[PDB]
Design a protein around this ligand. Structure first.
Ligand SMILES: C[C@]12CC[C@@H]3c4ccc(O)cc4C[C@@H](CCCCCCCCC[S@@](=O)CCCC(F)(F)C(F)(F)F)[C@H]3[C@@H]1CC[C@@H]2O
Ligand SMILES: C[C@]12CC[C@@H]3c4ccc(O)cc4C[C@@H](CCCCCCCCC[S@@](=O)CCCC(F)(F)C(F)(F)F)[C@H]3[C@@H]1CC[C@@H]2O
Ligand SMILES: [Mg+2]
Ligand SMILES: [Mg+2]
Lengths: 548, 548
């Protein structure tokens, strides 16, 4: 009554198992005198080597010998001999990579931050200059995105339980002592907090710690449902810009290091449709290049229809790689991005490390029949005839941008359109609501981002993708001799009623080594409908097929 | 009289050794009947499997079995048995990675393109879907940057020596038959060219081919001096944008895949100062992020002096990594970038994969003496006192932007300034020319790029880097306990008279494993003065120390 901020210790609170645990275990393993190693660590007290380390006076690699000094003469006071193969670097290396994020604590912090809490990490830690310091660096990267502040002892020159660092914390949070909970696995670090008037929590096991936190904050933290993957705030993203042609510039969002993964969105979407998988895939060891496909967002949207036929579209993606200096990327696509992705594989497989499509099956061209005839045969594609005459489909979709996306971006059990007889009634929205309810898949804010984006170039660019049926037919017919023998994945969505899974049923004919994925209760808008299981599928397939 | 275009075959002209050579060699190795393999390759003629392959009807992996079919029954006509361990995939894999760019031909083409020729590659080649097709993909990437067109048979559905493809070529070059030379290692591909009125050259050995080309073009191609590394045209580059703070956005150019290499330029420069090493390093297997440092170019240039002290500068580079999703990058710096780079290592070594500096030595702070006193002691730093009073140094450097860079960017034997008594005379240019001659290091065009860039935010941002001596002194003093134990390089420039090499002489005290480099006849502007030997040094050290 009333907290506003949450401060989490790192070792033994946000990250487990703690590194003090690898003191005690090593001793028992080596049958060393109880303590010894822990006595060497704490040797010297406030003026000891470990306190200098934690204040950033010296680096971890400077400390290793100083720590061994302490283990040499702690063992000489008890007249004990160190073991033949002792390496305090080796012990501490293992402890550090063994340490991993305590997931239920990290969720608990997100939850509190979702509800208006100012969260921060307060940790005694070190300037890590070891050969394998990249391990911890990643751990710290993943963590810090989720907190307003990361206060490390070696960066600020102050260390727990010194009262001064707590005053720093308060000053940094811009909050009074009784407005902040501080959780830590050490009694001594809580006393100074309590003295300023802070609520503290002695963290032993994680579950009991949350109960306390839960109780004192009055917000459900334990047992809450599995939360969504990390989303992307556009202004934190790295934005990239490549001109591939006189008046064609492609825009993309970049995040991660590793093999290039190029995400190609569908109709009527944007790079932001991959908001749930950009961070995930980065995290999985990949360099995500999430595209604004030509016609959309901050990519160019030149008026000409011809500019959006698959061939020119594909060539431009090649030029995009060329200018970025990439010999390959693994292309992953959805809806129209899917179609295009498959064609990159068939026409430029030297540039495609691997290929993957959500929802969109690879269907080869029918060399006898023209596709404009085939699409009249199947009434679920009746909306595509409507999209043919330039200007008509634009007027409606632009009439009210908000209404348009709210109406489109819905789960399969939230349908608000009649699918067929679209030319019949003359409009996609004819008998649809002006102010539709907000779908469970998308917040108000996420919609308005799409709204923002389509205010630049509208729907002429996007719709033109449907206006090169004949031209793409002729092109694809050149590939009818070919097959796909590079790694390929097909993810089907049970309840995509327009890109039905049955359409993919013959795909192993032209792609014999095709791997598959399937999602129950999944509409057309796969990525925001089932982001958790999409990432799970894609990462697994990336790690197994797209690298090693 | 007069050519305007040059067309180069790939296999056996721009890339050696040719893949037909790995037909003949394999036969001799295996004591196979003369021909056999070559007979299987050409089997079927215009309607054979190999002709289908070259037209993009089928992929390379589709062709392997069809080629083995032909090697099964070519050997059965002579009643011969194939060897126990025959694998026509294995033979062709080796041939393809063994094939490498014929460097003197590639130079010859650049030269011709430098002199107004429209260059193009005309090659019979294939849709490569092998497991190891990334090898050839890179080879093709490196090549195509240097040519206006790359015309592959499998992309256009036409093959040499079909007359139609030559007509395509002419149409693509927008040039008449007698305005184009076509070089190829096969007689049959020259006849159709000659019939339209083309000049041809039968390429056997490379040297004799150039003599012919040389003779018919009337431009020195053989024996010409070692040309400069590939430079960067800004509009072909990928441009990146990250906001690291409310009103601070960092801009960078990106090229390459692999470990992150972050290039930090000096005063008064830009990302473009690394124009010679961006492509090189990309090529060496690295992902180059060439920065516009805060205060410069399309990066923000906020007025406040404090915004350019090393600490905030460094933190922002950390945030830059954070938002790009990078746990580390290898930071390489020059002049002021150098100083900053060293401090990243001392304050954030978990984020620095390795560290490197051109010219700028690491000198630790003198904890007793304030640096503003030290800089008056040494008259070569007299220009830095001049840079202290806000506004004065700006007025002069902005007075004439062209004059300013022309005056600065000069080699050591082209000096046009008096170095000391700068406060004395009151100006960097006091007794310097209004229209200086154009330095051998920089074309007119390269200067005007710098001019363009500094028209945005001028010199307030840049100069402020020199205006936090006291604040950076206090900061650096915190590191006086530390050492640098991550991989580190120091490149010294013989004739940098302001960043003299002797300044670096004690650096192994705080950086015991420091590796070194030195360049003779090298001024302060290392990168454009000696771009060839800079890349050589940096790539070697990157490959040895920054990876494996
Ligand atoms: C398989 C096919 C013959 C070959 C056709 C073909 C071949 C090559 C090519 O480049 C295009 C096509 C058209 C295709 C059209 C099939 C594409 C299937 C859809 C994949 C593209 C994007 C689906 S996107 O419009 C769904 C958006 C729904 C929605 F956004 F909610 C909307 F608001 F309703 F629009 C091929 C024909 C379909 C039936 C016929 O048997
Ligand atoms: C080593 C030093 C004591 C410590 C000083 C220090 C410590 C920490 C710190 O952050 C800054 C300094 C200032 C430094 C200043 C030394 C920096 C040497 C220059 C590296 C920074 C950029 C050189 S840049 O101005 C050259 C541009 C030349 C030019 F562009 F052509 C210009 F037009 F002339 F300007 C340290 C003192 C110098 C002498 C004294 O013994
Ligand atoms: Mg702890
Ligand atoms: Mg050839």
């Amino acid at each position: 009554m009333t907290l506003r901020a949450a401060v989490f210790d790192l070792d033994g609170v946000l990250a487990l198992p703690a590194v003090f645990g690898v003191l005690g275990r090593t001793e028992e393993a080596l049958a060393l005198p109880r303590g010894l190693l822990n006595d060497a660590f704490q040797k010297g007290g406030p003026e000891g080597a470990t306190t200098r380390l934690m204040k950033g006076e010296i680096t971890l690699s400077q400390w290793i010998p100083l720590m061994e000094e302490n283990c040499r003469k702690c063992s000489e006071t008890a007249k004990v001999c160190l073991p033949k193969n002792f390496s305090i670097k080796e012990i501490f290396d293992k402890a550090i990579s063994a340490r991993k994020i305590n997931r239920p604590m990290l969720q608990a912090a997100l939850m509190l931050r979702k509800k208006g809490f100012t969260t921060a990490i307060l940790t005694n830690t070190w300037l890590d200059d070891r050969a394998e310091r990249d391990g911890l660096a990643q751990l710290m990267c993943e963590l810090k995105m989720h907190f307003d502040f990361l206060i490390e002892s070696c960066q600020v020159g102050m260390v727990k339980p010194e009262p001064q660092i707590y005053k720093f914390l308060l000053d940094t949070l811009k909050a009074s002592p009784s407005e902040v909970v501080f959780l830590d696995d050490i009694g001594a670090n809580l006393k100074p907090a309590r003295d300023l008037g802070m609520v503290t929590i002695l963290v032993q096991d994680t579950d009991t710690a949350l109960k306390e936190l839960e109780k004192v904050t009055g917000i459900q933290l334990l047992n809450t449902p599995a939360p969504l993957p990390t989303s992307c705030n556009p202004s934190d993203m790295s934005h990239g810009y490549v001109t591939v042609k006189p008046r064609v510039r492609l825009h993309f969002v970049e995040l991660g290091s590793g093999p290039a993964v190029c995400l190609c969105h569908g109709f009527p979407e944007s790079w932001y449709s991959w908001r749930y998988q950009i961070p995930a895939l980065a995290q999985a060891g990949y360099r995500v290049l999430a595209m604004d496909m030509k016609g959309y967002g901050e990519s160019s949207a030149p008026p000409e229809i011809e500019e959006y036929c698959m061939e020119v579209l594909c060539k431009e993606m090649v030029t995009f790689l060329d200018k970025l200096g990439l010999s390959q990327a693994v292309f992953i696509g959805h809806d129209w991005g899917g179609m295009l992705v498959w064609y990159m594989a068939l026409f430029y497989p030297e540039r495609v490390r691997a290929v993957a499509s959500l929802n969109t099956p690879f269907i080869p061209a029918n060399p006898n029949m023209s596709p404009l005839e085939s699409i009249k045969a199947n009434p679920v594609f009746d909306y595509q005839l409507y999209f043919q005459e330039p200007g008509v489909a634009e007027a409606e979709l632009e009439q009210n941008l908000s209404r348009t996306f709210k109406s489109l971006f819905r789960a399969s059990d939230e349908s608000v359109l009649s699918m067929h007889k679209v030319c019949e009634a003359g409009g996609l929205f004819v008998n649809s609501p002006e102010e539709p309810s907000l779908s469970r898949m998308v917040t108000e804010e996420e919609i308005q981002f799409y709204v923002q984006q389509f205010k630049k170039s509208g729907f002429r660019g996007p719709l033109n993708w449907y206006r090169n049926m004949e031209r793409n037919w002729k092109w694809a017919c050149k590939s009818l001799g070919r097959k796909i023998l590079i790694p390929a994945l097909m993810v089907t969505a049970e309840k995509d009623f327009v890109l039905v899974p049955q359409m993919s049923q013959h795909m192993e004919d032209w792609i014999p080594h095709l791997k598959r994925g399937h999602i129950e209760d999944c509409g057309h808008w796969t990525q925001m409908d089932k982001p958790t299981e999409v990432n799970q599928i894609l990462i697994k397939w990336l790690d197994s097929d797209a690298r090693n």
